[PDB]
Design a protein around this ligand. Structure first.
Ligand SMILES: Nc1ncnc2c1ncn2[C@@H]1O[C@H](COP(=O)(O)OP(=O)(O)O)[C@@H](O)[C@H]1O
Length: 311
């Protein structure tokens, strides 16, 4: 039965040069470990607040660590990064893919996943399939086979959407999860900045396990989405409307089908999935306007209740 809240974490980048040279004072104010205040305004509260100075490692421990242990326990997970362009979504989700200090969530999840698996007992054998694809103008494009540029969404026995005909790499080590991502990153350059900022890159890790003697199986999808600019569109709207029709709930029946993304994330947004959104904000007043709508989107998101089961 379970019933639990979409966690929501807030990560502010620091000021970059454009700003620091142009002056720019640091607008946001951090009280305790869960609350931020902008100027004289109302104070926002989230599951965590994560200033510029917090490390990748600590961002991981705060937002992701737990979602990993959920997937190994048979639950679906999903983390994603919402926010405006330049706000630090990719740094949080990916980071310097190969630096152990500067590496983001996906590589860390990769390592954490296999440290757990390696330590487990000989029976219960794991298969892990990953896939990597982006979205551009309501169209899915495979990052492991750039031949495929228009995959369709379908539904399983439980009437829940998945992407079909998606290349699948099989992995037995963190290092392979890395080369898969690197493949994808390369494939992209069969084209680019403007492109990336306005594509949604979705990285999917499917983990199936089976206790061999007892023959009982657990399973979970783990979506790790790096969303596009939510600034002032198409795909984010559906998500927002799909994230608006739920602070109230009741009889609304969310559009979901407004976009493929939402259709894929159906289960993440009011289904059998532990979901944790990371919202990324600039600390500059230049950007204040968007920072607030971001925060709105966040604050709203925390109201939603995922009903989750072991799968
Ligand atoms: N918490 C942070 N600490 C240090 N640098 C950051 C942080 N967040 C973002 N950056 C910097 O900003 C850039 C990343 O922003 P980006 O991930 O492109 O935003 P988005 O992907 O949301 O458009 C990088 O050059 C990185 O150095």
């Amino acid at each position: 039965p379970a019933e639990c809240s979409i966690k929501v974490m807030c990560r502010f980048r620091p000021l970059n040069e454009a700003e620091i040279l142009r002056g720019d004072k640091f607008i946001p104010k951090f009280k305790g470990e869960e609350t931020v205040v902008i100027g004289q305004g109302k104070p926002y509260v989230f599951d965590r607040v994560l200033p510029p100075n917090t490390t990748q490692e600590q961002v991981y421990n705060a937002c992701a660590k737990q979602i990993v242990k959920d997937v190994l326990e048979g639950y679906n997970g999903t983390i994603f990064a919402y926010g405006q362009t330049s706000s630090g979504k990719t740094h949080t989700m990916e980071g310097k893919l190969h630096d152990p200090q500067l590496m983001g969530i996906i590589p860390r999840i990769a390592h954490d996943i296999f440290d757990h698996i390696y330590s487990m007992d000989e029976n219960l054998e794991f298969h892990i399939k990953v896939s990597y694809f982006e979205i551009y103008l309501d169209k899915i494009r495979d990052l492991l086979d750039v031949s495929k540029t228009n995959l369709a969404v379908h539904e399983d026995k439980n009437r829940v959407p998945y992407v079909k005909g998606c290349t699948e790499r099989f992995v037995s080590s963190p290092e392979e999860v890395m080369d898969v991502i690197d493949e994808g990153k390369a494939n992209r350059h069969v084209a680019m900045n403007e492109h990336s900022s306005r594509s949604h890159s979705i990285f999917l890790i499917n983990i199936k396990q089976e206790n061999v003697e007892t023959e009982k199986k657990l399973s979970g999808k783990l979506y790790l989405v790096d969303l596009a600019g939510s600034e002032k569109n198409k795909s984010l709207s559906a998500l927002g409307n799909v994230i608006s029709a739920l602070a109230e709930g009741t009889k609304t029946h969310v559009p979901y089908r407004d976009s493929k993304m939402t259709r894929i994330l159906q289960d993440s947004l009011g289904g059998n999935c532990r979901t944790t959104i990371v919202i990324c904000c600039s600390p500059s007043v230049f950007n204040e306007a968007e920072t607030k709508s971001t925060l709105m989107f966040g604050q709203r998101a925390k109201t939603i209740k995922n009903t989750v089961s072991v799968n």
